[PDB]
Design a protein around this ligand. Structure first.
Ligand SMILES: *[C@@H]1O[C@H](CO)[C@@H](O[C@@H]2O[C@H](CO)[C@@H](O[C@H]3O[C@H](CO)[C@@H](O)[C@H](O)[C@@H]3O)[C@H](O)[C@H]2NC(C)=O)[C@H](O)[C@H]1NC(C)=O
Ligand SMILES: *[C@@H]1O[C@H](CO)[C@@H](O[C@@H]2O[C@H](CO)[C@@H](O[C@H]3O[C@H](CO)[C@@H](O)[C@H](O)[C@@H]3O)[C@H](O)[C@H]2NC(C)=O)[C@H](O)[C@H]1NC(C)=O
Ligand SMILES: OC[C@H]1O[C@@H](O[C@H]2[C@H](O)[C@@H](O)[C@H](O[C@H]3[C@H](O)[C@@H](O)[C@@H](O)O[C@@H]3CO)O[C@@H]2CO)[C@H](O)[C@@H](O)[C@@H]1O
Ligand SMILES: *[C@@H]1O[C@H](CO)[C@@H](O[C@@H]2O[C@H](CO)[C@@H](O)[C@H](O)[C@H]2NC(C)=O)[C@H](O)[C@H]1NC(C)=O
Ligand SMILES: [Fe+3]
Ligand SMILES: [Zn+2]
Ligand SMILES: [Zn+2]
Length: 341
């Protein structure tokens, strides 16, 4: 039993996974696919064991019978005595971010603007903002709301992909993987930072992690926090320090999923793998760090302190929360219970 097959999304995650595989002495090995959905399918077929997923994807995986195993836990300021692995998770803040210099843009004037999204089907990047927009407009035509977008996973010829840039060669425009310039938390924030889009749908952490010298990357080197504003649901604009009072939702943390039959073994191996290559890992600083990838958030978010135990042995619905689950279901009525594959 003692061999885990991880699923990497796109070639950059594949490279990191391969490095992890070498360092783990083949206790972990690698399968790779072009999209998160394709990785879920590999897991369903039994051709991979597990991968770490945004909540929108957990919904897809869970409808197909896959179960939550361990959750990303970032640093906090409550439960400070408990070990990270045993500390409850707090969830992240889904936000809408704009330029300060884009004056007079508010939640209530987004129609016909230009948007940047992590990917179709993701929590902060898609399910939350598009769910809110569908409800408020009373329309399922969320594909005509913004003039142009980068929403990796959408039809490449459509307005929803028009602002996506693809790779160095301009290949893979709008692919939902790290090859697409504007993919994920960091890519969607870059899309806003470079003024390609008017609004980015990301999380609070993303803004902090890519401003005021936190990044060193060329697009991010020179970005100042005061040059960004958050859009509140009441139509107000706030500094990025006010995220606790100006967010779109609180999201369940990204989490590892697997087949029920493999969950116990995946959990055992991962707890051991992080003891070696996690935050204070025995071999991290030094040989390999599983939670770093120079802000590219590959396999796991770079702000992950550890993978934490769940408790209550939750179903995917209990993990995501009834609130969020119904919000996703309601949104998916635009595009009632079954596996998508
Ligand atoms: C988009 O609009 C949807 C329809 O109004 C909405 O779904 C509704 O969500 C609410 C709150 O989550 C549910 O109301 C629930 O209220 C309490 C929560 O403790 C429960 O005791 C009730 O049993 C009930 O479930 C509605 O049931 C639900 N409506 C439907 C028809 O599914 C979405 O939340 C909206 N989406 C977003 C992103 O805001
Ligand atoms: C929005 O996201 C921000 C980035 O995640 C986050 O700021 C971070 O918050 C933690 C504590 O909550 C800070 O604490 C860290 O740094 C101190 C010393 O500087 C250490 O003692 C701690 O061990 C810990 O590592 C982070 O410094 C801080 N990150 C940055 C780069 O600013 C905000 O809390 C988030 N806002 C909301 C409302 O949730
Ligand atoms: O505990 C069993 C119980 O779980 C309920 O769902 C919980 C999730 O377990 C929990 O993770 C979630 O927590 C947060 C998450 O960030 C967001 O959902 C946010 O909106 O709320 C929390 C903020 O910290 O909360 C949900 C409940 O909202 C199931 O609904 C229930 O069926 C089950 O019995
Ligand atoms: C690969 O996995 C094996 C099996 O779990 C690990 O070997 C175990 O190491 C643990 C922790 O020190 C011991 O408690 C067990 O006695 C060992 N079991 C067996 C059967 O060898 C091994 O450490 C792992 N290697 C790496 C680098 O991840
Ligand atoms: Fe997410
Ligand atoms: Zn709130
Ligand atoms: Zn339960």
């Amino acid at each position: 039993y003692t061999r885990v097959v991880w699923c990497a999304v796109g070639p950059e995650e594949q490279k990191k996974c391969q490095q992890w595989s070498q360092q783990s002495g083949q206790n972990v090995t690698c399968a790779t696919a072009s999209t998160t959905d394709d990785c879920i399918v590999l897991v369903l077929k039994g051709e991979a064991d597990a991968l770490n997923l945004d909540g929108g994807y957990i919904y897809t995986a869970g409808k197909c019978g896959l179960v939550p195993v361990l959750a990303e836990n970032r640093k906090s300021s409550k439960h400070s005595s408990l070990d990270c692995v045993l500390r409850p998770t707090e969830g992240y803040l889904a936000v809408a971010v704009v330029k300060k210099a884009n004056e007079g843009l508010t939640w209530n004037s987004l129609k016909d603007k230009k948007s940047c999204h992590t990917a179709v089907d993701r929590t902060a990047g898609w399910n939350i903002p598009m769910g809110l927009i569908v409800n408020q407009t009373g329309s399922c035509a969320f594909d005509e709301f913004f003039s142009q977008s980068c929403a990796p996973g959408a039809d490449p010829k459509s307005r929803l992909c028009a602002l996506c840039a693809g790779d160095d060669q301009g290949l893979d425009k709008c692919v939902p993987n790290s090859k697409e310039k504007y993919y994920g938390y960091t890519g969607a924030f870059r899309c806003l930072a470079e003024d390609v889009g008017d609004v980015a749908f990301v999380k609070n952490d993303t803004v902090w992690e890519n401003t005021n010298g936190e990044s060193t990357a060329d697009w991010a080197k020179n970005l100042k926090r005061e040059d960004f504003r958050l859009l509140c649901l009441d139509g107000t604009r706030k500094p990025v320090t006010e995220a606790q009072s100006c967010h779109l939702a609180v999201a369940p943390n990204h989490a590892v999923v697997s087949r029920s039959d493999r969950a116990a073994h995946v959990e055992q191996v991962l707890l051991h793998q992080q003891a070696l290559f996690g935050k204070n890992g025995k071999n991290c600083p030094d040989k390999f760090c599983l939670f770093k990838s120079e802000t590219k958030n590959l396999l796991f978010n770079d702000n992950t302190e550890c993978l934490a135990k769940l408790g209550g042995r939750p179903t995917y619905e209990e993990y995501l929360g009834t609130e969020y689950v119904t919000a996703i279901a309601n949104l998916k009525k635009c595009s009632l219970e079954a596996c998508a594959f």
